[PDB]
Design an enzyme around this catalytic site. Structure first.
Site, PDB file in Angstrom:
ATOM      1  N   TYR A  48       0.839  -1.222   0.000  1.00 58.98           N
ATOM      2  CA  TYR A  48       0.000   0.000   0.000  1.00 58.98           C
ATOM      3  C   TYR A  48       0.889   1.294   0.000  1.00 58.98           C
ATOM      4  O   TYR A  48       0.402   2.378  -0.272  1.00 58.98           O
ATOM      5  CB  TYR A  48      -0.994   0.015   1.165  1.00 58.98           C
ATOM      6  CG  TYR A  48      -1.858  -1.220   1.279  1.00 58.98           C
ATOM      7  CD1 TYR A  48      -2.515  -1.541   2.491  1.00 58.98           C
ATOM      8  CD2 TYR A  48      -2.037  -2.065   0.179  1.00 58.98           C
ATOM      9  CE1 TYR A  48      -3.338  -2.672   2.599  1.00 58.98           C
ATOM     10  CE2 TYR A  48      -2.824  -3.206   0.271  1.00 58.98           C
ATOM     11  CZ  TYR A  48      -3.494  -3.514   1.469  1.00 58.98           C
ATOM     12  OH  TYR A  48      -4.264  -4.695   1.579  1.00 58.98           O
ATOM     13  N   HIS A 110       0.281 -12.178   1.968  1.00 58.85           N
ATOM     14  CA  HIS A 110      -0.694 -11.397   1.197  1.00 58.85           C
ATOM     15  C   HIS A 110      -1.474 -12.131   0.105  1.00 58.85           C
ATOM     16  O   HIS A 110      -2.674 -11.925  -0.065  1.00 58.85           O
ATOM     17  CB  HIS A 110      -0.019 -10.158   0.599  1.00 58.85           C
ATOM     18  CG  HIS A 110      -0.949  -9.007   0.384  1.00 58.85           C
ATOM     19  ND1 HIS A 110      -0.642  -7.944  -0.439  1.00 58.85           N
ATOM     20  CD2 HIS A 110      -2.182  -8.751   0.883  1.00 58.85           C
ATOM     21  CE1 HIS A 110      -1.644  -7.083  -0.436  1.00 58.85           C
ATOM     22  NE2 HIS A 110      -2.591  -7.549   0.358  1.00 58.85           N
TER      23      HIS A 110
HETATM   24  N1  LIG Z   1      -5.778  -8.924  -0.681  1.00 56.13           N
HETATM   25  C1  LIG Z   1      -6.070  -8.552   0.504  1.00 56.13           C
HETATM   26  O1  LIG Z   1      -5.673  -9.131   1.418  1.00 56.13           O
HETATM   27  C2  LIG Z   1      -6.923  -7.322   0.609  1.00 56.13           C
HETATM   28  C3  LIG Z   1      -7.627  -6.972  -0.525  1.00 56.13           C
HETATM   29  C4  LIG Z   1      -8.436  -5.856  -0.536  1.00 56.13           C
HETATM   30  C5  LIG Z   1      -8.515  -5.115   0.619  1.00 56.13           C
HETATM   31  N2  LIG Z   1      -7.814  -5.440   1.711  1.00 56.13           N
HETATM   32  C6  LIG Z   1      -7.938  -4.591   2.926  1.00 56.13           C
HETATM   33  O2  LIG Z   1      -9.290  -4.391   3.159  1.00 56.13           O
HETATM   34  C7  LIG Z   1      -9.594  -3.026   3.165  1.00 56.13           C
HETATM   35  C8  LIG Z   1     -11.096  -2.875   2.788  1.00 56.13           C
HETATM   36  O3  LIG Z   1     -11.245  -3.156   1.433  1.00 56.13           O
HETATM   37  P1  LIG Z   1     -11.447  -2.064   0.244  1.00 56.13           P
HETATM   38  O4  LIG Z   1     -10.534  -0.955   0.583  1.00 56.13           O
HETATM   39  O5  LIG Z   1     -11.100  -2.827  -0.979  1.00 56.13           O
HETATM   40  O6  LIG Z   1     -13.012  -1.659   0.144  1.00 56.13           O
HETATM   41  P2  LIG Z   1     -14.166  -1.244   1.135  1.00 56.13           P
HETATM   42  O7  LIG Z   1     -13.581  -1.057   2.402  1.00 56.13           O
HETATM   43  O8  LIG Z   1     -15.227  -2.171   0.982  1.00 56.13           O
HETATM   44  O9  LIG Z   1     -14.601   0.103   0.494  1.00 56.13           O
HETATM   45  C9  LIG Z   1     -13.856   1.287   0.485  1.00 56.13           C
HETATM   46  C10 LIG Z   1     -14.585   2.405  -0.243  1.00 56.13           C
HETATM   47  O10 LIG Z   1     -15.820   2.657   0.317  1.00 56.13           O
HETATM   48  C11 LIG Z   1     -15.993   3.986   0.682  1.00 56.13           C
HETATM   49  N3  LIG Z   1     -16.629   4.008   2.002  1.00 56.13           N
HETATM   50  C12 LIG Z   1     -16.117   3.734   3.192  1.00 56.13           C
HETATM   51  N4  LIG Z   1     -17.032   3.876   4.141  1.00 56.13           N
HETATM   52  C13 LIG Z   1     -18.156   4.205   3.556  1.00 56.13           C
HETATM   53  C14 LIG Z   1     -19.444   4.500   4.001  1.00 56.13           C
HETATM   54  N5  LIG Z   1     -19.816   4.430   5.265  1.00 56.13           N
HETATM   55  N6  LIG Z   1     -20.340   4.811   3.069  1.00 56.13           N
HETATM   56  C15 LIG Z   1     -19.996   4.880   1.813  1.00 56.13           C
HETATM   57  N7  LIG Z   1     -18.825   4.601   1.369  1.00 56.13           N
HETATM   58  C16 LIG Z   1     -17.877   4.289   2.202  1.00 56.13           C
HETATM   59  C17 LIG Z   1     -14.584   4.598   0.644  1.00 56.13           C
HETATM   60  O11 LIG Z   1     -14.470   5.967   0.382  1.00 56.13           O
HETATM   61  P3  LIG Z   1     -13.539   6.904   1.186  1.00 56.13           P
HETATM   62  O12 LIG Z   1     -12.310   6.202   1.497  1.00 56.13           O
HETATM   63  O13 LIG Z   1     -13.371   7.952   0.206  1.00 56.13           O
HETATM   64  O14 LIG Z   1     -14.313   7.417   2.234  1.00 56.13           O
HETATM   65  C18 LIG Z   1     -13.840   3.731  -0.346  1.00 56.13           C
HETATM   66  O15 LIG Z   1     -14.032   4.276  -1.615  1.00 56.13           O
HETATM   67  C19 LIG Z   1      -8.492  -2.398   2.350  1.00 56.13           C
HETATM   68  O16 LIG Z   1      -8.282  -1.043   2.573  1.00 56.13           O
HETATM   69  C20 LIG Z   1      -7.333  -3.182   2.927  1.00 56.13           C
HETATM   70  O17 LIG Z   1      -7.007  -2.767   4.255  1.00 56.13           O
HETATM   71  C21 LIG Z   1      -7.038  -6.537   1.729  1.00 56.13           C
END
Ligand SMILES: NC(=O)c1ccc[n+]([C@@H]2O[C@H](COP(=O)([O-])OP(=O)(O)OC[C@H]3O[C@@H](n4cnc5c(N)ncnc54)[C@H](OP(=O)(O)O)[C@@H]3O)[C@@H](O)[C@H]2O)c1
Length: 315
Positions: A48, A110
């Site tokens: 990241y 990862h």
């Molecule tokens: N391969 C892996 O192991 C892996 C893969 C993917 C993700 N991850 C981890 O999981 C985390 C979560 O996944 P993600 O980042 O893919 O997606 P997510 O958390 O499902 O969604 C993030 C998005 O949703 C918006 N958001 C957040 N809260 C909200 C709310 N209450 N209402 C509306 N929109 C909202 C955010 O906007 P803003 O940020 O602009 O507010 C951002 O655009 C990642 O950051 C990372 O830490 C790990």
């Protein structure tokens, strides 16, 4: 409860702040705001490239007496270019140095495929074909186990592993430290019933990312299912006087699955942890679970034909 107790008896908070895609100039403030809203679990990764800013945020809140180190649950992850043991040690020390910590609570593999070492995270030949390595996740695990013995990492886990891959880890000759979590994509369109059942029955807690379907993903297409627009979720949100995101997050917490919604928006960071003041009915949970369509947004899909790709198996 606000936590799930791991095999080691350490307590993993059920709600954590995700950081993937948080710009490096915005993540320090998001983590400060999270700590102030009572978050204690923070999910970060080498790839990241924002771990330094997360570590500044944590250090500032510790120094201010806002939170004690022992009450935080910090997670990071080893990237697939670093499976070789010496490379693994340098990558880890950089992740620990960037975060300004003495130990991690959880260090994850990862992805399960190893990728060719070098400067790039996604190495490619001239054709643009991704280059794999000769090191397996087993190979990487042996390196990582030393970190546990050293006191640098409290526990080890996996991410984007299928149940056959975890079996292989559990049956590795000479295994010393069993995996404590599997972190995988989870939302009403990818419920993960069988994988969650399997992990829970194996001493392994689950961590669900992309609970809001990652709307900031870079390759979103109009034809993709839209987690945040599911009609039954608006229904249920309205009944509980909660937001759609709060229902989507609660859905995991209530299955005793940890969840790491990412936000850099102060109001949304606050909103997302406001999920320990309501309970979804049996019918509500049964209805959310109905939505499953085995649809994934996240993963390294270009490597689907190489060994150890996780997503071909049913679970
Ligand atoms: N391969 C892996 O192991 C892996 C893969 C993917 C993700 N991850 C981890 O999981 C985390 C979560 O996944 P993600 O980042 O893919 O997606 P997510 O958390 O499902 O969604 C993030 C998005 O949703 C918006 N958001 C957040 N809260 C909200 C709310 N209450 N209402 C509306 N929109 C909202 C955010 O906007 P803003 O940020 O602009 O507010 C951002 O655009 C990642 O950051 C990372 O830490 C790990």
């Amino acid at each position: 409860t606000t936590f799930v107790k791991l095999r080691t008896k350490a307590k993993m908070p059920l709600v954590g702040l995700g950081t993937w895609k948080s710009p490096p100039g915005q993540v320090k403030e998001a983590v400060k705001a999270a700590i102030d809203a009572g978050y204690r679990h923070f999910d970060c990764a080498y790839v990241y490239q924002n771990e330094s800013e997360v570590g500044e945020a944590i250090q500032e809140k510790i120094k201010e007496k806002a939170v004690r180190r022992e009450d935080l649950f910090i997670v990071s992850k080893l990237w697939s270019t670093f499976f070789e043991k010496s490379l693994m040690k340098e990558a880890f020390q950089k992740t620990l140095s960037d975060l300004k910590l003495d130990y991690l609570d959880l260090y994850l593999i990862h992805w399960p495929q190893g990728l060719q070492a070098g400067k790039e995270f996604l190495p490619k030949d001239s054709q643009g074909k991704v280059l794999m390595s000769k090191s397996t996740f087993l190979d990487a695990w042996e390196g990582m186990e030393e970190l546990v013995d050293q006191g640098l990492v409290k526990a080890l886990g996996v991410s984007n592993f299928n149940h056959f891959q975890i079996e292989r880890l559990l049956n590795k000759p000479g295994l010393k430290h069993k995996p404590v979590t599997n972190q995988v994509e989870c939302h009403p369109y990818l419920t993960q019933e069988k994988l969650i059942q399997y992990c829970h029955s194996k001493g392994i807690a689950v961590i669900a990312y992309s609970p809001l379907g990652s709307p900031d993903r870079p390759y979103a297409k109009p034809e993709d299912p839209v987690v945040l627009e599911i009609p039954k979720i608006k229904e249920i949100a309205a009944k509980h006087k909660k937001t759609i995101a709060q229902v989507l997050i609660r859905f995991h917490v209530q299955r005793n699955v940890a969840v790491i919604p990412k936000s850099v928006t102060l109001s949304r960071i606050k909103e997302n942890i406001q999920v320990f003041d309501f309970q979804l009915s049996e019918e509500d949970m049964a209805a959310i679970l109905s939505l499953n369509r085995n649809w994934r947004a996240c993963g390294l899909f270009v490597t689907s034909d190489e060994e150890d790709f996780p997503f071909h198996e049913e679970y």
